[PDB]
Amino acid sequence: ENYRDIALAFLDESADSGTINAWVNEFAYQGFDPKRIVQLVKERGTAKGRDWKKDVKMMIVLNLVRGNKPEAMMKKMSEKGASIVANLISVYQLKEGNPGRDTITLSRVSAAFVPWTVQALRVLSESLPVSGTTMDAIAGVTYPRAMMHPSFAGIIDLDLPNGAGATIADAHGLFMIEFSKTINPSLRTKQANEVAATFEKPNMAAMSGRFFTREDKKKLLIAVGIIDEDLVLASAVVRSAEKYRAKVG
Amino acid sequence: ENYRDIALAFLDESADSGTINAWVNEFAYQGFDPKRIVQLVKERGTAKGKDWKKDVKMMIVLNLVRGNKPEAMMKKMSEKGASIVANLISVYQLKEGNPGRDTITLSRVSAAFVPWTVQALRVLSESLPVSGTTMDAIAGVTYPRAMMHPSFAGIIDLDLPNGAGATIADAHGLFMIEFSKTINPSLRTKQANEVAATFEKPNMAAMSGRFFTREDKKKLLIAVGIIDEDLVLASAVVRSAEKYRAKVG
Amino acid sequence: DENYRDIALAFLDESADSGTINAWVNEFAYQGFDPKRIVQLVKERGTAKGRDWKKDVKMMIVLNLVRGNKPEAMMKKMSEKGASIVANLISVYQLKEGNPGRDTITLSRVSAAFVPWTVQALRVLSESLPVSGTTMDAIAGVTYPRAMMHPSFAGIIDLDLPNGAGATIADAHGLFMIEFSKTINPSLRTKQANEVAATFEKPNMAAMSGRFFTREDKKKLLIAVGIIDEDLVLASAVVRSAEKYRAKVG
Amino acid sequence: ENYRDIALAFLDESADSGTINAWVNEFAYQGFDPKRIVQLVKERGTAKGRDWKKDVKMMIVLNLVRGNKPEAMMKKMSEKGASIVANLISVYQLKEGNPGRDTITLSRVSAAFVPWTVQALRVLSESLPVSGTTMDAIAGVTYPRAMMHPSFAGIIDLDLPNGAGATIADAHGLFMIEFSKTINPSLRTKQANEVAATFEKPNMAAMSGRFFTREDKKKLLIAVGIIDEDLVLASAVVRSAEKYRAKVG
Amino acid sequence: NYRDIALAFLDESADSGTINAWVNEFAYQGFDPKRIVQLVKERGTAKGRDWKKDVKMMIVLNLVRGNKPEAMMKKMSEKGASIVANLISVYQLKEGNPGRDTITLSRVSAAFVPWTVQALRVLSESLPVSGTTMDAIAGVTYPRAMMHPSFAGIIDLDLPNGAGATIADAHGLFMIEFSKTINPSLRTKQANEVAATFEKPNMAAMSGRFFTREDKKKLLIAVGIIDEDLVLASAVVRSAEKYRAKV
Amino acid sequence: DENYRDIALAFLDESADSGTINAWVNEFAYQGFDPKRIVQLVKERGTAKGRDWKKDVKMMIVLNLVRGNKPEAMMKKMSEKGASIVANLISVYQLKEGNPGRDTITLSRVSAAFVPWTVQALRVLSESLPVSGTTMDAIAGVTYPRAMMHPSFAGIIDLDLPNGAGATIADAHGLFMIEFSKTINPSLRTKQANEVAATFEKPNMAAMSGRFFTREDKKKLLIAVGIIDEDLVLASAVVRSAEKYRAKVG
RNA sequence: UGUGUUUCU
RNA sequence: UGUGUUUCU
RNA sequence: UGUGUUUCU
C-alpha cells in the first residue's frame, strides 16, 4: 500500500538534465567507433611520416580482395605486395581480428572510410570474394557495386521517407548472405534466414550508427547512385530487395 | 469399483465457468510484482547505506540506454561507468532476462519506478536505441517522448472513456514495433502485425497491472501530456494511433 | 537327456495350473502408474489434513491445465494469493515436479485419474490452455472438441469401439497431441508430424489400453462429453480432425 | 599376366541356380536355434540346482505379460516379482532384443517351449497386452486363445492339405496386427497390410522352422483345438482368417 | 641465376631405365587383384581344397551377407556356419581394414568379378538391395550385373562416345542405394552427399589396370551391358539419366 | 580535437585513378608460390645435407607424377624400399602437402619449378600416370603430346604467341586437364566439360601468366618438346586436341 | 541492436 | 583417384 | 504398449 506510494513519489523526484546526461556518457556503448578508427589511422600514419590517406586506400583495396587477415595473406602473396603489407601492419598495428577499443583492422578501415570504399567497389567488382557477375546472376539485375561489401551498411539511412531505407537494407542483405557464405563455409548448407541471422545484429548496429548525419548518408547514397536527387530508388535496388525478402520470408 | 466409482462420480461434480476462470486468474503467469521490486530496492539499498533513490535513477537511465544485460554491457563501457554498474549489480543483486518475481532486473526497475522513467525519456530521447527524431519521422508529428519505452504500458488505463485507453495503447504500439525491430533485427523483415504479436502478451500484462489505480494512471498520463485534465487526447497521440492501425490492419 | 524335441513336446502334458499361473501374473504384472493408487493417495492425504479434497482436485486440475506440471516453479510466477494456495496443495498432497514413482502424486496424475472432471473443465478453459481452442480450431478445419485438448483424454478412449470408431477418436486426439507436445518441448517444433507423434504414442497407448475404466465406463464418458452419441455415431468434428492427423503423419 | 587369365576364366565358370540357392539357404539369416535354447536352459538350470522346467514356465508367463526386456520390466514390478526375475536373469543369462543364437531371451523361451506357452495362453488371456475380450470383438467369434502370441507361428504347418496352413496363418495374423499395433503404437495409423509387412519376415521364419516335424505340429494344433483329428479347421479359425484377408486385401 | 638453374634441367639426364625403376619403387602398393587371386589360390591349394568352388561360395556369401564372416556365423544355421568357419580358416578371412596380404569377401568378389557378375543374375532378390527395389528406382529393369560394387572393376571409362561414363552413371544409381543400406547414417543424406562417400574408391576401381580394355569390353558384352557394336542397352542409359538427375 | 567525420567524407572526393588502383591489385594479388624461391630452397636444403639435389629433384618429380601431392599418405601404400627414400625427401626438403605458404616446398611445386625436366619425364612414364597416354590418345583423335600430360605444363605456355597460338596450346592442354581433374576428383565426372574446366581455370591461368620464365625461355621449351617448331608452327596433334577441347566446352 | 565472422585457389 | 564402408531381420 | 515430457511469456 506504501510501496505504491513510494513509486508514485518518483513523479516529483528530480530528473536533472545535467546529471542524467553525465550518466548517459558514463554508461554509453564504448568499442567500435569510426571516429576512433580515423583518429588512430591518422595519428599512427603521421607519426611514421606516411601518406596515410594513400595507405588507407591500399588497406581498403587489400581488405576488399584478400579479407581481414594481413599476416596470413602475406604467406600467399608476391614479395612485392607482401613487403607493402608488412609495412601497413607495422605502422597501423593491424590485427587479425577480435578488435578492442584501440585496435585497427582492415574491416575497420573499410568501414570508417566507407565513402572511399564505396568508390573502389565500382572498379574491383570482379576481384571480390563474391564477384559482381555472380551477384548479377543472383539478383535479376545488375547488382549495385556500391553495396558489395559489409561497410555499405554504415551509409544506410533507415529513416528515409517511404521505407526507402528499409528497401536499401533489403537489397544490401541480398549481398550479405552470399558474402557470409563465402567467408564461412559452414553456412553454405543453411537456409537464407539462418544465414541472415548471423549478420543482422552487427549489421543493424552499423545502420543505426550516428557517425554520419542523415544528410551525410543521403549525400553518399545519391553520390553512389543508390537513390537520386528526388530520393527515387534505382530499380536494381528495389528488385534486389524483393529477391531478398522472398528468400528470407 | 470403489476408487473407480469415486473418480466416475466427478462427472456430475460441478464445473462452473466463473469459479474456474477465477482460479485461472489466480494461477495465471506473473512475470514480476512491481510492489516487490520497489521493496527489495529500498531494503537492499538502505542496508548498504546508499542513496537508493539516486541508484534507482541511475539504473533506469542505464536500462534506457543499454538494455537489460548488466554483465554484458560492462564489456563495452567506459571504465568509470562500468565501475558503478558493478556496484549496482552487487548491492541490488541485478540479474538479466526473465527470472523469478523476487529478482531485480534493470527492466523491472524502469517498470516499477515508471513515474520517473517517463520523465527521463523527456531528456535522453536521442540516446535511445530508437531515437526521438526517428519516431518523429515515422509519426507525422513529434512523437511523445514519454511513450518511448516498454515501461510506458504500466501507466495506461485501458478503461478510459470512449476507448481512449485503446487509442493510447495503439500510439504506444507505434513505438513498440520500431523498438522491437532494432533490439531484435530478425523482425525487421516481418509484417507490422507480426511484429506487434511479439510484444502483445507482456504489453497487455503491463497495461492490466493493478499496482497503480486508475486515478494514479490518470494523474500520470496528465502529468506527462498524453491527456489533459478533461481527459482529451493530445493530437500527436491520436495521430500516432491511426498510423499504427493502418500499419497493422 | 539330449533328445530336446521330446522334452519340449512333453510340456504339452505338463501342469498349467490356473491358480499358480494367476499368482505369477500378479507378481510379474506392471506396477507403477495406477489411477486407483492416485485417487486413493489424493483422498487419504487430503482427509488426513481435513481438506475438502474433492475441491482440491478441481483446483489441482485447473492448475495443471493452465500452468503445467511444475508447482514449485509456477509459484515464482504467480500472484501471492494464488501462490499461497499452491503452497498448501504441494504440502498436503506432497506434489512433485516430475519423475514420479509408485506413490508419487503430480498434477498430471491428478488430471489423468480424475479425467471425468478434467474433461469438463476443458469446455470452460479452452482459451487459457497452452494451445488455445481457437488455435486448434484453425489447425483442424472445424471447431476442435474441447474435451480432447489434454493428454488425459486418452484415458477414456475405447479403442475397441465398433467400426474403428476408437481408432478415429485416437487419431483426432493425436491432432492435439502434436501441438501440445511442440509447445511444452521447443526442440520438437522443427520436427515433422510423425517424429513428434513418436515422442508421445508409447505412453499414449498405455493410457488408451488402461483397464481402470471399463469399456462401458468409457462409452458413457465419450457420450457425456459429446465425442460420440447414443447410437455410437461420431461427431463430424472428430472424424475431420482425425483425417487431418492421418494426413500429417502418413 | 597369368593371374589375370585365371580371373578371366571365371567367366566360363558355371552358375547353376539350384546349387547357388542351396548356398543361400545355408548362409541365410537365422535369428536363433530353438534346439540350442532348450539345451542352454536345461544346462544352465541344472548347473544351479534349479527346477528348470518350472523356471521355463515362469519365464514364459513373464514373457507373455511383460515382454522381452528383463532389466527394464523390473523397474516397474512388485519387489517380490522383481526379486525372482533378477534370479532368472542371473542363472539363464537373459538378454534382450535380438542377440546371437547362443543367447537366451524371454521371447525365445516362449518360442522354444511353445507346447507349454500355447497352454498358458488359455489361462491368462485377459492379462495380455491385447486381451482375449479385445480379440473376441475384432473377430466375430471367440478368438482361439492359443494364437494370442507370436510364438504360435512355431506350430503352424504351412504344408497342410487344402491350404489349411495358410488359413491358420491368416487367422494368426488377425492377432498379430493388433499385437503389433499396441507394442509399437506408431503402427496404429498405418494400413492393415502395412502393419502385416512389419512381422511378415520373422513370422514366416517361425512357420518355416523345422525344429518340430509336420506330425509334431499336427499333434500340437489338434491338442489345442485349431484343427481336429480329421484335419478340419475350427469355425473360429476360418472366421478369423477371412476377417484378416478382408483387412489386408 | 635460379632461373638458369631450372632451365639447365632441360639438358639434364632423363634416363628411361632409372626413371622406370623409381616408378616401380614409388608406385601404389595395396589393393591388387593379382595378389588377391594369387593368395586365394595358394592358401586354397595348400589345404587341398577345390579353391575355385570356395571362391564361388565366398562370393555368394559376400553378396547375401556382406563383409563380416565371424559376425555372420552367429546368425546362421549350423550347417552354413560350419562351412564359413572353414573358409575363414584356410583363406584367413578378415572382418575389414585389409592390409596388402589380407583377404576379405569384398576382395574375392572384386578380384573374381567375372564370376561375381554372373551370380548376380541369380541372386537378385536375396541382395541387400533387391532387384525389384532397383527396378522401381530406375524406370526400367535395372541390369543385375551392376548390383554390386565389384562391377566397377570391369568398367572401361574410355569406351567411345562416352559409353563408359554412361555405364559408370548407371552403376552409380545402385551404389547410392547400396551405400545407404549398409550405412544407416547416410539414409537422411542427399544423393550427391552419398555419392561423395563412394566415388573415390569407385574411381580407383574403374581406372584399375588388372583387366585390359579389351578384357573389359568382352566382359561388358558377355553380361549384356553393351553389344557387339558397342551399343548401350536402354536400361543402362535410362538408369544413367536417373543418376545424373539425382546428383 | 579534429573533425574526423569530415576527414572521412573527404574521401568521397578523394582520388581513385583506375590505373594506379589496378597496379596495387596486381601487387597485392594472391600468389600460390614463387618458383624462384622453390629452386632456391631445394638447392640450399639439398646441399646442406650433402646430397645430389639435382637427382633428388628428379625423384621428387617422378614421385609427384605417379603418386600426387600427399607425401605422408602415399608412404602408407608403397613398397618399403620406395617409402624409405620418400621419408628422406620429406626430411631434407621439409615437404608439406596441399597449398601452404610460398616458403614451403611441395612435390607439386617442384614439378612446376623444374618443369623443363618434368616435361621430359612425361615422355617416358606416360602409362604410369593417373590418366594414361593411351587414354588421351583415344580422347584426342591422335597421339596426345606426352609433355602436356601434367598441370605443370602450363608453366611453359606463352599466351602472347602470334595468331593466338598460345590460346590454342592452352586449349590443347585443357583437353588433358579436364580428364586429369575428373580422375583425381571423381565427383566432377558427372559435371559438364565447361564446369570441370572452371575448376582449374584460375591456377592454370596463374601458371601461364607466370613471369619466372621469359617468352624466349617458353618458346625454346615449347620447341624443344615438339609443341611448336622453330618457325612457331603448331604441331598437328596440338591443333587437333585444341578443337576437340573447344567442342567439349563451347 | 553493440559493428563481428574473413573460406578455397 | 588409392579400391574402402557391410545396417535391419 | 508401461501412462512420461511441462517451453516461452
Numbering used by the authors:
A (entry chain S), B (entry chain X), D (entry chain V): 4 to 252
C (entry chain W), F (entry chain T): 3 to 252
E (entry chain U): 5 to 251
Give passages from the manuscript:
Toscana virus is an enveloped negative-strand ribonucleic acid (RNA) virus that belongs to the genus phlebovirus in the Bunyaviridae family. The genome of phleboviruses, like other bunyaviruses, is tightly packed with N into ribonucleoprotein complexes (RNPs). In this study, we have elucidated structures of the hexameric RNA-free (apo) N and of hexameric N in complex with a single-stranded nonameric RNA. As in the RVFV N structure, each N monomer consisted of a core domain comprised of two α-helical lobes (the upper and the lower lobe), and an amino-terminal α-helical arm which was divided by a short linker, hinge II, in α1 and α2.
The RNA-containing N crystals had 24 N and 12 RNA molecules in the asymmetric unit, which were arranged in four almost identical hexameric rings. In agreement with our ITC data, only every second N bound an RNA molecule, whereas the central RNA-binding cleft of the neighboring monomer was empty. In all 12 RNA-bound Ns of the asymmetric unit, the 9-mer RNA occupied a defined position in a positively charged cleft at the inside of the hexameric ring, where the first and the last residue of the RNA could clearly be distinguished in the electron density. Tyr32 stacks against the base of G2, while Tyr32 of the neighboring subunit stacks against the base of uridine 9 (U9). In this way, each second N sequesters seven ribonucleotides, while two overlapping nucleotides are bound by neighboring subunits. However, the amino-terminal arm of the RNA-bound subunits is considerably displaced against the N core domain when compared to the apo structure or the RNA-free Ns in the RNP. Every second N monomer was laterally displaced relative to the neighboring N leading to a staggered assembly of the hexameric ring. In this way, the six-fold symmetry in the N hexamer was broken, resulting in three-fold symmetry of the RNP. However, the simultaneous binding of Lys204 and Lys79 of the adjacent subunit to the phosphate backbone of the RNA led to a 45° rotation between the subunits, with Tyr32 working as a pivot point. This domain movement created a new inter-subunit interface of 480 Å2 at the outside of the hexamer, which did not involve the amino-terminal arm.
